[model samples]
Target: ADNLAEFHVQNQECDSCHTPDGELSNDSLTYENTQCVSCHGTLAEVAETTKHEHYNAHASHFPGEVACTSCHSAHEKSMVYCDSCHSFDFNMPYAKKWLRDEPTIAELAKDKSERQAALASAPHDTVDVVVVGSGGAGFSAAISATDSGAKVILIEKEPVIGGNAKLAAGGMNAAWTDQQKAKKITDSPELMFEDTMKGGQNINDPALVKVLSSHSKDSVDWMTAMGADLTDVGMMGGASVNRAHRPTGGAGVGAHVVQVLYDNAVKRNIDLRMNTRGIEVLKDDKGTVKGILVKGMYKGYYWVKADAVILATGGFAKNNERVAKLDPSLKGFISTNQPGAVGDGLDVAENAGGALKDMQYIQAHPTLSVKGGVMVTEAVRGNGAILVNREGKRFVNEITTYDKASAAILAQTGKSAYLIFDDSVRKSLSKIDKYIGLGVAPTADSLVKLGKMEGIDGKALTETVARYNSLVSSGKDTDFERPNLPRALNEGNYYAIEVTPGVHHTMGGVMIDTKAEVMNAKKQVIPGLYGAGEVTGGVHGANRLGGNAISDIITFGRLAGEEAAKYS
Candidate 1:
């Protein structure tokens, strides 16, 4: 409200549809229709509250009650028009504060006008909730929103559900779980937060990070209640403790979790439409985002009225053009994201007044194969694997953060990297069969054989092993100062999986506050705009942590849905 006073009427004014300002542009013109207790002290206090209810000023009927529109003439003409009629600078921070290269209203209207025929004539549907994207975040949101007794519609672009999240295999993470206790691993939310901040290089939003850390155990418990099997657990890179909540029998935790959540939504009769896409957010001229412009496989296009929206449309890795603008070096890399992981909700949310943040920070997982299209879980390093280059020389502390490891890998000769582990380590690894079955991992009983297999000098392989083993015996990694060396790589029958950094997760998108409310550039909340998952940024600062991605999606997905349901 204080900032609203500073605008003093916008210069350009959100094309006249933004209502009084930016913060309120996406906010619904809402109030408690529930109570009428404000007619106090002969209605004297009612006059004081009337000015605050600015939306009513725009309505035909207002204060002191209308008898024939003559006595209440002053009440009919409003202060809203007073605010609206003034011309102020649009270039000021308050006006374009949350906007990011957003097309002007003229441009939107121009583009919308061409499609107006289809947009108007198409069929229409209404629901309490509109969730974009069918991945973990979207699915979780639909279920949570349905739990609030609100009708929901989840829009998916693919024929099947589960976005890139289905490609995930490493499992989720949590703190102080039953698995942690059964495994005798002592950990807490604070320890989790410490590790998360360190893994994110301390740039993660402390509040969102805190929520993730604190609610991890409960999040795991929530999934378990949803019939998700979180029985298996383990450690991963950058984690100070073994706090992961691996699904039972492991190989497709992403798929398994998605199925579990989707089943719950189905049982609750949630509306999940496949091959459907939400093209634009439907907002009224008064600044309420009450619907979405949708298009289906055969239905052409339609409008779905919604009380709230949750964006979980994955990342923009599918579009190299979008990625290049953020990080030019990531342009040609293979994406680990699913086919539909284009920045969909990104623009839709912003058009209704949301801010984009940390977009330059995109994450490339360190162990994904460059040519084979395989993604090796970071847990491999936890099981004693090391990243070696063309010369069979280790380049980095294998268990470092994904961003750091990826950068080190990209700098190596031919920009090629490989993960080498011994038989014992392979035995301990849970996802080894997954790689071997896909022909991405090969076994060699001898270093010479391994060199011949991967095109590396045999002697260099022998030298690298000897050097690593010597460091293990000395209790110190002198070269890279890597911590937590649990064992030596002396188990014979070594295995190597060729890998290169590839586009994995994006750490940038719409900026959100801890309440899940999307904020504009000036840091003001864009009411009705809530975000979760990768669709919103500021959770994982410059680099996202391993296992944190799943945790992020479910934790905030619930919050976003629950909060959005409040308005419904």
Candidate 2:
């Protein structure tokens, strides 16, 4: 007892016994005890008062002198631990107890069994229409078909509905507005068509663009009537007028849209099936689609007979490995798409004699963080932020559109650029944190510091900042002629967020005419088949102007929905 302090210190410092020395230094021990007090003093005290710590205590066999670092490294710790090895499936007991106190193993088992039963019975013997995907396009088609008085069956592969739409930040596009008239913003369907075609670099089909633009107003009105909260955010991307209407809130806009459509489907008694994947398209003797083979949750599979099928499955952004195989330049790039976006729909369609188009075109949001690969919303730049490079210098014009910004970033050596902003920009901007929900945006201190974190030269970054500040002070970006007198990079605690190329949307799929009928490679209509959304190509040529994608889905979805119902 008299030599307890020295004995404990010696024990902590025993190199041979501890395996890794300095396991319990004075600083580390002190840090471990007081770390929680910084933000959660009261909660920590109350938590320690219970038996919670005892239940969660480390195993007795663990090294006595070992600190948390013995197993958990600060920045680079492995996600799995010993509990992962010894756990039942996925720590079921822990998850159950944590989600709700007093875990009920019986209820958990019952839920799983019910899910399995649902999967077993998911296959439909026959249906008037079968729509694949649960995204904006798929649900929209189902709703349209049901409204047309046709029995519709909608299938989604994910555990839930809403694909990339759940992750979109921008709003939908429509050119109809009395307010635009009041503002003297003249726009027409033809102009909108031209903008989309030009934006896609003339890769989109003119006929499809004409159809999408012609029906844009009607689609917007339909969505408005369907409980979609369309806000007057004016034009986003490169639209002509105040055309794009965003949802009230930025995050989960697609979810809200899909929910409204889903509710409408339920009210109309449209057959809705979640967690059902369309594995293959069955064709008739005449090479027309007859039905689809579906794989349900828990490894169950079956065939659903249908007169027509619409594919609204999203793009292949999350399938970087596959996309990289097609376009090697996209390799190692981070995508903001959901983990489930593995190009299943594209694969199925292409395998079933469908021609794949525009596999190389990809969209890269300009202002994502470099270190964490987080997206920084274009709204930030619209509200007043500047784009800079590793040298901490402004590289492009501030008022340029997102596509141009992306091209500028690509022009850089590694196709990486940093977005520099200050507290002023954050406060002034709308829907910025929403990008964080999409896994974009990184907070940082200064240009030099951010450069260091991103593996850029610190001195070069400092000089770049100084040069840009000088140019701004002189009231001229002579080198780039950036419009709107974009803010300089001299602000304190300057944030430097990095962004890379991302696969935003697909412009290729089942061939569809103006009426949204599925056509084969021979340009002949496939009987009993229809398509809408990103799964059907032609509305967007080679590249899509930002706001036009939303318009394409709503317009074509409504068209296909109405047509399917009529035929059924």
Candidate 3:
């Protein structure tokens, strides 16, 4: 026996963990997980066993209780679960690395008989609602649907959940919140709507933008009600005021929100099927959605009957070839998105007659570290870092919208920029420590030394810091008219990271109405079909502002779930 079963049998009988009532199935590993925790400690307690800062297996950002068999196989190979979405190579016992035979776009083009065979055998399971993808939006939709009196099933194509939502390093945007009131920030829904429209160049659907703005505060309140920490509010690009809400100490908001949502979903006992890809949205002859055809890691192809389906499958940022097909200029750029964001849901939606929107609207973040694909979030600049070229000269207003900033960086000599910040700037946010540990952010006692280490003009870098400090004292950035100047760069222990543009988002996606109902090419609502998050379009038209992605996902995810539940 090459599996954990061998090691376990050497110490104890099979009845030690399994029941004598029936053969050992452990389909969902529900009972087996209970046994594992009963013998071992709880996940949090087990997390105390490993102290590695980043690769802690037990204390990961995963929201709910993970099944022990997800990583440890009983009669087969075991693997590090987190490596499904990440590239981390953690040492584990009896590991042979469980891998998925990922289906490609060509394989999804099934013949009619093959699709009919999906339903030839009756549905393997039935639920009132089926939610695809397990990111922030999918979890939000599942929880909302369950709360709205619908039994839901969430399916994720990857072994690990949290699509690109887990990769979100910035904060979430919301307006007219208690947090804002506490900070005395006079922001309103009207202002938020205007800012969003302006950021998207007024090409955004005003109806959807209105919903995003009006429902934003309630969305933040919704997360906070579930014990999420959004007390820390900050700024981002293309905004008139500070409206980005996040965890205390400016920790990453995406994983935190996903955790809260995942916990709630588990509390509601929503069925989750992992390594399951929704290949097609099954509709009946009456043009109404009946269920979905899914391919599972263990179950193979099968139907999951449901009255309503919501697609929250995120975007195509990691699908660099598809991204390049849409925006040719963005060809061959690095990406900061999770590996699961390949726009498969878009194909499924289109197969069900859901029309596409803004298919060409892609976005690039301005400060992806040249060393790693790590995205230095916009919050860093909003917190008072500056972007300088190789000459140590400020190029663009560091706080401008991502599209403009990316373009400005690409136009520079080497199509790259250096993110320069001081100790105060680093201390303001917690993510900088991870960047420092990854060796992306080089440090020095002074600005000149930091510049010398990164091949920047040391004298010009020193002058740039001094001049920026003078402008900070003057309360105006005459050079670039930088709007948000939190502090001067006069603090000691400077840091610099060379960064370039990377594909960060796909603003265009499946077309959906304000209610989050999927619309067809005929401009008609596709019955019982809904979408939210990066899977749907019209939230941000041409460009997505920093922090707005989280806002869009949660807000519309709730709407999609509620509306789909009603339909069900």
Candidate 4:
């Protein structure tokens, strides 16, 4: 069978998979997903039947109830959902050909005058709110707006959802959360605000900083209400205390958050469309935002009339040309962003008179694995790992701000440094298992052997480890004054991964005020237009903290959706 429809209907009637009315739940395919699950048993049971030694698709990090149709479409070709982020291959039955040869928006709209003529036609669809991305921000916005009694349409240009946000390895930052309370870690919104302002060099919008801090606990609560597992609380760079919250184990937080949001959005039946791009934000004659000029991979160009538009399409970290144009020093730099982060949202919002702020503030993460460009989470260092130069000497505190860490690594002998740890650190962070399997983190039974394998001075690495263990036992870092020294590197089976700076976040985009409403170049609100997540500036002024991106997206994305819903 080329597809599931042809294969399954041979044995059962169409209603066995769909509703009795023969109607399709294209918005979410909730009915079809339930049918699949009821027949195949739970995802865990299916995973038990088809488990892989290396990587198992059914037992992925995503929730067990992740939609079967997300990757196993009946009428159309199926895809390996994991390929959207990781490169793991799984043999899927009844899957058709997977293609990426669809015409781009530019190619489809090359006939400019004719393309413009199509806009004169009545809109193909109408909604109360239209969101322009499918990442954390878009899902958050769509779900919030729907709950506020507004019809919504969410679109993503990529075949897969999850923008650069999908690459978020560290957790979300939130002070005064239940997780922090459980750990007996005292924290406050005021302290988080101060840390954010100081980390961003005080150029951060004080109002936006306050909103992010004060409303962060609510965002965590909101996610957990939808069954998100953010029980783990830890520290990240540029924070006053341990306020980073993620999964129970030290798993990557981005995918987990997105999965929960995606699941909830689907449950509410928000109109979610992938392979769809919002080319321009449509407006009325008086400059009030109106709708969107959208292009769909299968449906072509069309109009979606809406009362409000939310730009959550994330940043241009992966777009090398755009990044270099904004910040020339970032040219040729590797990035940890998804390929769809091309700053299209900026252009889309700007067309509606939205102003761009701090457009040049691109951030380079300190610890991208040089071997494969995988982002080494700041949590690794937070859990206790040391950064050493090729000479096997500690230079800076491992948990310092990313910008400072990047500079220190760039000044090293080979413009990179080795992240050294032992079995204890590896045991603490579950993500290290994937890194080890991917050949990003190489391990050996002894420190000297690991040092020699990574081309570092073995004796010096041994001495560095000894001194770091001594500091850990003494409850102080005498050499670099590292603030959090939780564990030592004495356990056998040492690991090391050479890392360098890579483009991580763009701390700038369409300017928005505290209400999550987009502003024009004149600093006046562009009514009916909203912005959130990496698409908006003023949250992280110059440098973003490790865990704040998740917070920024949830806090402001919800605000945008709620405000847009009210306006609609």
Candidate 5:
């Protein structure tokens, strides 16, 4: 049957698909293809997953009820329409509760100047809390107090946050299920505590170690909750079990951890002022701490009142002059600490009736760059690196713990040694050559051309390589007994980097009780004063083990926070 039929669709207009009436349609759809699937191909499925279509009330106006162009324009960008209907104060799903004020030079300066003014203006306002040093320990305690709803103030002499924590390679020691199960290594807190005390030469405060050991799990868990990604790097230092944890960022782990705490402080509306150096802790008529007098960056001076003070500013690593005076052997060695670590907190605490503890013990790292003052992580040796001397003979067992290696290197008569390896060794080592733009996996040929093996002559280097290869091939290291040889030195040109003894960490600072409260020489806790992290002594006695330092900082930081919050 020859009949003329015409059908029309509702809400169909030329401009809906085209810019102008006569212009071609953008999709070029015709009357024959005007079905539901024609225009809304995959978009119909996509709309199902989004909140705008499923959760909002605008889903019913599909392809026919409303023109897609009314709400969305392919040519014109879409506006954030949610803002129009929603109140600005309505918190989003992922909104952070804490907000930090931008750290400006002016704000920083004001902090410094206010401290000086406070000291000059009210020389006797009782401070509730007085925190010294600005490293992880100090920041940890300060943040903890703010979390506990306490009005807290922190003091740091450095230009910015971070102390020796900033210099750490970011590895810590903790027994976590994921790490232990993965490595098939069993570990317990008791073993960890015993190892830590023994490593410290049994001079550590038994009570403090007991507290730290009991709270190690909680400390590690808190760090993880604070967004720190820890990696299980097996065992390190003198740890009895495989409980060593390494931070994902390596050398910047301390900085990262401190930054997280700072962010938390801001989120909780904690009043954390930086660059404000604590000159002295204010005391009342009864000799109790009132507030602290500080010098701001540019604001001259100011005073902050607190019920208690926690000192976490770190140790005397940067005080080379003082260190030399205390121990003559550390005279010329350059410190591997931030320049601002001048024992300011220690001095002020002592002046305010605080006593110094563990003043004689100092910790020295084993592997330091011969040319530069950079510290090489012990993980490098624990992995499978080798250390040789100028004679191209392997000196210390590469597989031993870092403390023993340091002692072994020092016993080499000259206090200097070279860490020789091939390209494979270089690549496998963590944070060693990466700082200097070296190849990821160093090869023998590549290393030789790079001139990394400078001190030893070419012939001498070749002979050294031959001897090392022979030992590796024979599955025995007669010189050092490196244990479990992985790869022979048959690759190519060898390389050598010099190593020297460097001052790593300071084991002495203000004395503190188990709660991290600063104490006098008579073992009496100073009222309204607390100390946590490295600034408080008695954690590490004669020397500190490698991975335990991080545990100490986090554990004491939380302790200080809980205590400060209670006091507030």
Candidate 6:
């Protein structure tokens, strides 16, 4: 195929199609798609030859909209990613082998329905409290309630125990902690609360913010006493100081803290069920949530009758449908979330008399890899990396809050940019090697090569570095005012990561009060119902600070469970 350069990185990774044409402009995808039909017969001819009874190849694609090159790459082993939704029996001889036998949506639904039919009249399990989800908030709720002498059962929809918490980088925010005092870092709950309220643009519930800030130290201390490590306190963006604490080792926060919570829960004899989805919140005649309807992955549905029910089902960042309904512009943005972040509990809780809030404010993280949308944690920028456009010019102050940074990145010409940093900065990162191992960060020996790697102008990058080096020497940033430059561009190897803004968090969710009790439209507390973590809104307002995720999860999660236990 000609004009391979037109496809850019696609041609680099899938090297079969070389652009015979010298150069091309960004016109329409239709022109580039013509090369696909030129190499293989016409779309109609190809479709007829490979048609199978199980596959509706015609309706799958249109001549003007999509091309064979969409799924069948000329160079690499390609797989139709949508095969799972379509029962296609024909083998492409080009697509991935594992994808050919994928089941359709209808089959999946039939399987679930059949499984439920097989379990006739399953007995209801009663507990003091039932917590849905196994992430930070879920486990925290379960642990808090159980420790307070409540019989708790934690349930997860996925086969694994951990939710999005397992994937988190583990940055927990607190103030005036032992670690901060040991480092002689000046930080106070009042300062953190102010910073959080400012970051949230004052729309945050001041009451919830106060409680979070006040209890942050206790939560950290409690988690620490639970055998979890928090030796490193990171200086994240929008924070007054270095109050975001992470694990001592390089492992991510989600894996370590969730593991700690999971281990402690097991030791405490907490009843945990996996592949159990919370279908609906069951209410009594008085309109109080007394139990929930749950369905197992392969078994019949059952009722979980409890004194109280806590929802820690995370957020809807991964649910494109819900996310799009909230922010239509983010309809197709790649998400840095786990599959279980579908807001399953939000609707269930709402139907059971829980009020919802901030349904429109979805948090867009600034630095996610453009490839698979994997999160390039804020710590990367925190470690002295700078964002550069195709011209290799810094567009926004890299240290700005996620909301501002995300907006600035979106304002960039291509809605993306490259993050550049030197070897010294990379060496300073605790998880830099893991990022490199994941192939998310590419290395370049010089600024020119860095630009070439990211499709940026070589001379522009050289000039950009020259200017930044000058600032590095002056110790003053004029374009974007900063207290001081964190790091500089050195002659050592440079790392360039292709990044773009993507849906990172959901700021809106079920409404909860300071006590973490789910409320109704009238602001009346919904009896026996509670929410924590991303499931609750009005805590962070319009924007969420980076490390506040775990902070909110642990703090409010504890409150939700504790309040539920005392509801009677």
Model 3 clashing residue pairs (backbone): none
Clash pairs (backbone) in predicted model 1: 11-88, 11-89, 11-90, 98-521
Q: In candidate 5, how many Å is residue 49 off?
A: 43
**Which regions of candidate 5 are displaced past 4 Å?**
1-130, 248-252, 399-407, 410-415, 422-430, 438-443, 446-452, 457-495
TM-score of 6: 0.78
Alpha-carbon runs more than 4 Å astray in model 1: 1-114, 118-123, 473-475
Q: What lDDT would each prediction earn against the true structure? A: 0.71, 0.62, 0.86, 0.84, 0.62, 0.76
The sequence of per-residue lDDT tens digits that candidate 3 reaches over residues 279-348 is 8888899999999988776546788899999999999888888999999999998888866788888988
Summarize candidate 1's per-residue lDDT along 1-568 as a digit string, tens digits: 2343224234423323223432321111111110122212222443454443222222221121111111111112211211221222223222222211323233455656545875666437778888888788888878888898888888886545677776667768899888779879899999989988887778888998999999888888999988888777766787887777776544546777887887788788776776577777767777777677776643556787777878878777666678888898888877766555668668777777788988888888887765467577887786677778889788899888887898898899987788888877776655676677556788888887998988877789889988988998999999987786766888768888888887878888998888788787889876566788988888888878788989999998888888888877
Q: Flag the better candidate by TM-score, 2 or 6.
A: 6
Candidate 4 residues 515-568, lDDT tens each? 999998889998899999998889999989989999999999999999999999
Query: Residue by residue across 403-486, what tens digits does model 2's lDDT show?
Result: 677778888767787666665555444466444433345555765666777666777777766776677789887877754444
Runs in model 3 deviating more than 4 A are: 1-28, 31-50, 53-58, 68-89, 93-101, 109-118
Cα RMSD (Å) per model?
A: 20.3, 14.6, 2.8, 4.0, 17.6, 14.6
Q: Which candidate do you rate higher for TM-score, 1 or 4?
A: 4
At residue 318, candidate 4 shows an lDDT of 76
TM match of model 2 to true structure: 0.69
Which candidate number has the best TM-score? 3
lDDT score at residue 74, model 4, on the 0-100 scale? 83
Candidate 1 displacement at residue 429 in angstroms: 2.5
In model 6, where do residues sit more than 4 Å from their true spots? Answer: 1-123, 249-251
lDDT of 5 by residue, 146-201 (tens): 66666666665543456678556636676644656665877777888898888888
Answer with 1 or 3, whichever has the higher lDDT.
Answer: 3
Ranking of all candidate structures by their TM-score, best first: 3, 4, 6, 1, 5, 2
lDDT of 4: 0.84
* Weakest ten-residue segment in model 1 by summed lDDT: 25-34
Output the number of the lDDT-best candidate: 3
